[PDB]
Amino acid sequence: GSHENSNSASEGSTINYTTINYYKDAYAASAGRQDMSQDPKKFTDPVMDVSDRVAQLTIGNSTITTQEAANIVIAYGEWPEYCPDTDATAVDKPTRPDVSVNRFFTLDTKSWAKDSKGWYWKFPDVLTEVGVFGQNAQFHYLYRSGFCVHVQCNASKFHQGALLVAVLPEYVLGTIAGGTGNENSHPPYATTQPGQVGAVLTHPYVLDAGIPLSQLTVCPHQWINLRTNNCATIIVPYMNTVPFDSALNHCNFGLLVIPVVPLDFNTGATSEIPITVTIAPMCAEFAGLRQAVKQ
Amino acid sequence: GSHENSNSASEGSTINYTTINYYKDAYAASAGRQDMSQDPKKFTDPVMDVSDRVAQLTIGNSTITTQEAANIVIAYGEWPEYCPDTDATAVDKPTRPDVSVNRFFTLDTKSWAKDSKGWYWKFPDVLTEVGVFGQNAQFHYLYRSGFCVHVQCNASKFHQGALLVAVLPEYVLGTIAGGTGNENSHPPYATTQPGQVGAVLTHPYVLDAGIPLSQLTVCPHQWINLRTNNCATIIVPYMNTVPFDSALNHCNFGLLVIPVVPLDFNTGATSEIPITVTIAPMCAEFAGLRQAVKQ
Amino acid sequence: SDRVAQLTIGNSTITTQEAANIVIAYGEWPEYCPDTDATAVDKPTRPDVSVN
Amino acid sequence: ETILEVNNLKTNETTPMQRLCFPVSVQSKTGELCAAFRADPGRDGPWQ
Amino acid sequence: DPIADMISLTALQVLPTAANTEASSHRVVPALQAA
Ligand SMILES: [Cl-]
Ligand SMILES: [Cl-]
Ligand SMILES: [Cl-]
Ligand SMILES: [Cl-]
Ligand SMILES: [Cl-]
Ligand SMILES: [Cl-]
Ligand SMILES: [Cl-]
Ligand SMILES: [Cl-]
Ligand SMILES: [Cl-]
């Protein structure tokens, strides 16, 4: 016959394929002709405005005023949003705290030195133990949220250097395998989930994960070039293969700050050049209430 | 003249008075004639239905099923409600957690003995350190909420006794003044805010405050008479001279459970007769976010 | 925003930003010689991109 | 707007002009506290 | 009602063949980018 069941992996996309088939199940069908869709404007230009430096963003009881801004990036061209009913799976009514959790939290500050390797933080690991957000993350099994990341770094017009600020979804870390490569070692909880203090990259060139830093720009990113800007901002939507997930067992993405062009300045100029990270979860939703669990 | 300023203490009520006046300020006016309004149906009959035993109330992820119920009391005939904009004063946007806080919490259980004096708990003191509700109470300066109180006590058809369950707003406690009455002693924090374990009355007849237990029924109350019912339920609206207040420094009301007719039963029948308290805040609102404070 | 600029001609492009605007000598733009002014009768060659 | 004497120190009283402004300088340590004061406007202090 | 505080830009396109090239001449700052 020819009429069948709707069980192909690509049946819920606005991209159709022409196929041939004689079995009752759709996945048995051939790959077919490939339509030719394209969205080059979500990676190459996921910027704000699809006097830009001058700004001020407010959320919750917190407000940031950025002026040497390099505009704002909206990761993959999508805004954070509460989970829609079609995608939802868990049946209990989620709690949406709003103001007490969707606001700006400012984590520890790091110091940029002429020989710094680079740092990274995991989300939501960084806030699991901070304010009301953290508390909700502990009392609930499920969590879902978006993020606003603001990285700050000032310096005089006589300093120079460039930080690459990027977001890498599912940032799985690897070990140097005993050096020789004969030891199947693994990163300890302290390295995979460094908490709010973040961690240091030992081999930035390969992002401590066997992949080229040179290609990290294929991820939502922004640069902080001292002669141009002193802060970067990136809005990040929720990304996962599931609608909600544990804020404890799974880190949706990592934030990397790497000095691609090393800090330099003539001796006599301020040598303490800090980098500060301020983040705000957006559209935080929690579900599966029970007692508090720290991990 | 005769036209003046609107500054009398009774200018915002649906009860007018006829007066005489020659000063520009309204409060200078006489008391005047008293209109004759009355609402005897908020104290004498603030009951549910203005098969009643059979029931089931659900709020949050919790559900109570009561069947030897004595109906339900709505304190002073008013339902809990989020604070309205006309009454509000604080300008920041409040957080309204909903499900994570408006649900049923079941506190420690007490044991009713033939010689028990009676117990009491303070609100919101009892939950300041419990679940998400407590956490919000700690992180916020201001709090406002209503309450659903469910007191439970089972016993066989061969036991007897009667508990008076009442709510007393602003339950200020007093000391026995050194006995002779020459010592101006005061109750310690542990007696005024006993926490979730509650406290024991030393002189129930005068409610440890120089007032007759005999008149406590002038307050929202309900009886648990073993031969008739084994649980009581009272909805309580927010009551204060201010729209919001500290959940730490001020207890809006106390819950009293007193054996007015002592427990009795023939030896051989179950002697362990517990009393359990389950409460659910309603329409919880918090404001004035900052860091967590325990007191 | 007169300083900010970019002029392109042929396979070359200049980007000037601390510019002081641009001067057009004697208020006239360059132009191929018109037939009324022309005198030599052979057809001229106008290479375009390879020279301009 | 009128000036707040945030720098209301006991050591300024003889050189009061110094109370009209407080300093910031190159820090050697991150996240240091620069100054603090109560917001109570009718209270004795900077607001006076 | 008694409370007043309780009341994606990019899309797809079908491109079957590579974009074309159009003619231009000797003539706004599009060469310098803010990467
Ligand atoms: Cl094909
Ligand atoms: Cl550091
Ligand atoms: Cl390296
Ligand atoms: Cl009268
Ligand atoms: Cl117990
Ligand atoms: Cl007990
Ligand atoms: Cl007594
Ligand atoms: Cl710090
Ligand atoms: Cl004041």
Contact E4 B84 (CB under 8 A): no
CA-wise closest residue to A30 among A8, A15, A61, A60 = A8
Q: Which amino acid is at C8?
A: T
Contacts of D18 (CB under 8 A, 6+ apart): D7, D12
Separation between Cα atoms, residue A138 and residue A291, nearest integer Å: 8
Are the C-beta atoms of residues A31 and A17 closer than 8 Å to each other?
yes
Please give the DSSP secondary-structure letter assigned to residue A30.
Answer: -
Dihedrals phi, psi of A218, to nearest 5 degrees: -85, 0
Separation between Cα atoms, residue B74 and residue A91, nearest integer Å: 31
CB-nearest to E5 from B81, B86, B93 is B93
User: Which chain A positions have a beta carbon within 8 Å of D31's beta carbon?
Assistant: 108-109
CA-wise closest residue to A83 among A92, A74, A94 = A94
Please give the DSSP secondary-structure letter assigned to residue A171.
Answer: -
Separation between Cα atoms, residue B238 and residue B121, nearest integer Å: 16
Note the Cα A176 to chain centre separation in Å. 24
In degrees, rounded to 5, the angle at the alpha carbon of residue D25 between the alpha carbons of residues D20 and D31 is 110
Contact E9 A50 (CB under 8 A): yes
Separation between Cα atoms, residue C24 and residue C4, nearest integer Å: 18
CA-wise closest residue to A119 among A196, A43, A175 = A196
CA-wise closest residue to A92 among E33, B63, B184 = B63
Are the C-beta atoms of residues A112 and A161 closer than 8 Å to each other?
yes
**What resolution does the deposited structure have, in angstroms?**
2.7
Is B243 part of the contact surface with chain E (CB cutoff 8 Å)?
A: no
Are the C-beta atoms of residues B145 and B281 closer than 8 Å to each other?
yes
User: Hey, what's the torsion of the CAs at A80, A86, A92, A93, to 10 degrees?
Assistant: 50
CA atoms within a 13 Å half-sphere pointing along the CA-CB vector of E12: 9
How is residue B265 written in tokens?
A: 């039963």
Contact E13 A38 (CB under 8 A): yes
CA-wise closest residue to A210 among A183, A177, A188, A240 = A177
Instruction: For residue A204, give Cα distances in angstroms to A207, A210, A216, A261, E27.
Output: 4, 10, 11, 13, 45
Place of tokens 């990270």: A277
Taking every pair of Cα atoms in chain B, the longest distance, rounded to a whole number of angstroms, is 83
E strand segments, C1-52: 7-9, 12-14
**Count of C-beta atoms within a 10 Å radius of residue B169:** 16
Are the C-beta atoms of residues B57 and B48 closer than 8 Å to each other?
no
Please report the sign of the dihedral spanned by the C-alpha atoms of residue A174, residue A177, residue A183, residue A186: negative
Contacts of D26 (CB under 8 A, 6+ apart): A270, A272
The packing angle between helices A131-139 and B131-139, to 10°, is 180
CB-nearest to B132 from A96, A98, A136 is A136
**Count of C-beta atoms within a 10 Å radius of residue E23:** 4
Separation between Cα atoms, residue A147 and residue A66, nearest integer Å: 17
Is A46 part of the contact surface with chain E (CB cutoff 8 Å)?
A: yes
Instruction: For residue A227, give Cα distances in angstroms to A68, A264, C5.
Output: 10, 12, 21
Please give the DSSP secondary-structure letter assigned to residue A19.
Answer: -
Which domains, ranges and CATH numbers included, belong to chain A?
1-295 (2.60.120.20)
Local structure of A29: helix, strand or coil: coil
SS3 per-residue string spanning chain B: CCCCECCCCCCCCCCCCCCCCCCCEHHHCCCCCCCCCCCCCCCCCCECCCCCCCCCEEECCEEECCCCCCCCEEHHHCCCCCCCCCCCCCCCCCECCHHHCCCCEEEEEEEECCCCCCEEEEECHHHCCCHHHHHHHHHEEEEEEEEEEEEECCCCCCCEEEEEEEEEECCCCCCCCCCCCCCCCCCCHHHHCCHHHCEECCCHHHCCCCCCHHHHHHCCEEEEECCCCCEEEEEECCCCCCCCECCCCCCCEEEEEEEEEEEECCECECCCEEEEEEEEEEEEEEEEECCCCCC
How is residue B213 written in tokens?
A: 């237990």
Separation between Cα atoms, residue A275 and residue B272, nearest integer Å: 64
Are the C-beta atoms of residues A219 and A46 closer than 8 Å to each other?
no
Is D31 part of the contact surface with chain A (CB cutoff 8 Å)?
A: yes
Å from CA of B175 to ligand 6 middle: 22
Separation between Cα atoms, residue B24 and residue A165, nearest integer Å: 67
Separation between Cα atoms, residue A256 and residue A168, nearest integer Å: 8
Q: End-to-end alpha-carbon separation of chain D, Å?
A: 13
How is residue A125 written in tokens?
A: 């690991």
Are the C-beta atoms of residues A16 and A35 closer than 8 Å to each other?
yes
Contacts of B161 (CB under 8 A, 6+ apart): B112, B155, B225, B226, B259, B261, B262, B263, B264
SS3 per-residue string spanning chain D: CCCCCCCCCCCCCCCHHHHHCCCCCCCCCCCCCCCCCCCCCCCCCCCC
Dihedrals phi, psi of C8, to nearest 5 degrees: -125, 135
Q: Is the peptide bond before A124 cis (omega within 30 degrees of 0)?
A: yes
Are the C-beta atoms of residues A260 and A155 closer than 8 Å to each other?
no
Separation between Cα atoms, residue D24 and residue A37, nearest integer Å: 56
Local structure of A164: helix, strand or coil: strand
Contact B286 A94 (CB under 8 A): no
Separation between Cα atoms, residue A264 and residue A279, nearest integer Å: 27
Dihedrals phi, psi of B232, to nearest 5 degrees: -135, 150
Separation between Cα atoms, residue B244 and residue B141, nearest integer Å: 9
Contacts of C45 (CB under 8 A, 6+ apart): none
How is residue D25 written in tokens?
A: 């300088």
